Amino acid sequence: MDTTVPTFSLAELQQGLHQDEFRRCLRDKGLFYLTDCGLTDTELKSAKDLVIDFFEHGSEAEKRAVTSPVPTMRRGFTGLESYSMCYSMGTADNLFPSGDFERIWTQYFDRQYTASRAVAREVLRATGTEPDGGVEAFLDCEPLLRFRYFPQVPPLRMAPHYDLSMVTLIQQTPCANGFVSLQAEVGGAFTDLPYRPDAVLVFCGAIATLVTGGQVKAPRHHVAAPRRDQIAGSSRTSSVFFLRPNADFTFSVPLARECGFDVSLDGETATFQDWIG
Ligand SMILES: [Fe+3]
Question: How far is the CA of 184 from the centre of ligand 1 (A)?
């Protein structure tokens, strides 16, 4: 029935406003747009410009030195070869082309990490939730940022997934031609998730569901390639920041499958580590 995605100001939520609507939204949709949270369009454009500058003008030997060694370990570039190029970062072990790149992207990652902790902190407070060990130890974690860029201009459809994250924050730049790759299931339909001025998009992931004892939905979503007719003017970017728990974070396996999550393992409990390793 209900297929819209709400918008909230983070400062207002922190200010105690809109408590009932926020709780409903988490339980029933697990996704929303967010303003006033310490992220800006301008910070995104600059980070984006630098990486595109490198894509276009970095030499062959420079490009190889920052290309990721093994895709398992998720750092450096992919697809620079001179669909899409990709740049990934974590809290350490990062690969940078230059000093200014390192500074701008370190700052961008820090702000994004900070915005994500603040959002997660709000999700836990609205569901009256205290993870074991405390909120702060839990949010001081092992996050990952992935920035994708689709150049071509100025195919297999994959199945919707949920994210293996406490929270995921998504910023994007729009397509000239109006095309929207990001879609989620809300109330039984597939809804578009476009660029919205001065808003970051937020998804709750499975970890949010687990940590709140089922009070938050993790929405299924997929990103779609353009069809042949909608290729002209389909260049775009996204920045995706996964707030992932520490490897030693633990959960009840009754609970996990009871929520509908493919779990290989068995027993009373497990870690996040073995749930992907
Ligand atoms: Fe995803």
Answer: 10
Resolution in angstrom units = 2.5
Identify the domain containing residue 231 by its residue range.
Answer: 1-277
Distance in Å, CA 160 to ligand 1 centroid: 8
Angstrom CA distances, 259 to 105, 178, 208, stand at 36, 36, 12
Q: What residues act catalytically?
A: 74
Counting the structural domains of the chain, the total is 1
- 167 CA to centre of ligand 1 in angstroms: 11
Neighbour tally for 107: CB within 10 Å: 13
Q: Which of 153, 31, 144 is nearest to 83 (CA)?
A: 153
Rounded CA separation 85/29 (Å): 31
Of 192, 180, 195, residue with least CA distance to 234? 180
Q: What is the C-alpha separation between 208 and 194, in angstroms, rounded?
A: 24
- CATH number of the domain at 89, please: 2.60.120.330
Distance 96 CA to ligand 1 centre (A): 25
How far is residue 111's CA from residue 261's CA, in Å, rounded to a whole number?
A: 31
Identify the experimental approach.
Answer: X-ray
Are 219 and 161 in contact, with CB atoms under 8 Å apart?
A: no
- Kindly give the distance from the C-alpha atom of residue 123 to the centroid of ligand 1, in angstroms, as a whole number: 19
DSSP 96-127: -SSHHHHHHHHHHHHHHHHHHHHHHHHHHHHT
Query: How deeply is 183 buried, as exposed, middle or buried, from its count of CB atoms within 10 A (0-12, 13-18, 19+)?
Result: middle
CB-count exposure of residue 210 (10 Å: 0-12, 13-18, 19+): buried
